[PDB]
């Protein structure tokens, strides 16, 4: 494990500062978030200044994908719930645990895809 680099973080900041939610924000996010844990991805989203309406639409998308995940993965290391993949009810160690398991559950890659789904919807919003 390494925390997402500050360089990575600062690039993401200048990307969003400068492009708001132009469609180019999406390939930049994907390049800058390679191999990220859910916690790292939240650090990235939380460094975003302002844009509270955009951030609200993103959270609603995340919450829908999490509920859909929960609908297809009933309960019974625990298996992650949707909120665990989104990093809001899971610890960093738990995220690393899933990602390095055999077989692995790539919670970072799943959450990144949910975020990209949200960013596509925001892009439809600034357009």
From Swiss-Prot:
Organism superkingdom: Viruses
Compartment list: Virion
Transmembrane stretches, start-end: none
Modified residues (Phosphoserine): 5
Record's comment on post-translational modification: Phosphorylated possibly by host MAPK1; this phosphorylation is necessary for Pin1-mediated virion uncoating.
Name used for this protein in its record: Capsid protein p24
UniProt function note: Forms the conical core that encapsulates the genomic RNA-nucleocapsid complex in the virion. Most core are conical, with only 7% tubular. The core is constituted by capsid protein hexamer subunits. The core is disassembled soon after virion entry. Host restriction factors such as TRIM5-alpha or TRIMCyp bind retroviral capsids and cause premature capsid disassembly, leading to blocks in reverse transcription. Capsid restriction by TRIM5 is one of the factors which restricts HIV-1 to the human species. Host PIN1 apparently facilitates the virion uncoating.
Oligomeric form and interacting partners: Homodimer; the homodimer further multimerizes as homohexamers or homopentamers. Interacts with human PPIA/CYPA; This interaction stabilizes the capsid. Interacts with human NUP153. Interacts with host PDZD8; this interaction stabilizes the capsid. Interacts with monkey TRIM5; this interaction destabilizes the capsid.
Region: Interaction with human PPIA/CYPA and NUP153, residue numbers: 46-76
Span within the parent record: 144 to 278 of 1435
């Amino acid at each position: 494990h390494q925390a997402i680099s500050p360089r990575t973080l600062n690039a993401w900041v200048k990307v969003v500062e400068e492009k708001a939610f132009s469609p180019e924000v999406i390939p930049m996010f994907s390049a800058l978030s390679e191999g990220a844990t859910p916690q790292d991805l939240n650090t990235m989203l939380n460094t975003v200044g302002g844009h509270q309406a955009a951030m609200q639409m993103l959270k609603e998308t995340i919450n829908e994908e999490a509920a859909e995940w929960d609908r297809l993965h009933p309960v019974h290391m625990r298996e992650p719930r949707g909120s665990d993949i989104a990093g809001t009810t899971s610890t960093l160690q738990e995220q690393i645990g899933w990602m390095t398991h055999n077989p692995p559950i790539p919670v970072g890659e799943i959450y990144k895809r949910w975020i990209i789904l949200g960013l596509n919807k925001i892009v439809r919003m600034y357009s």
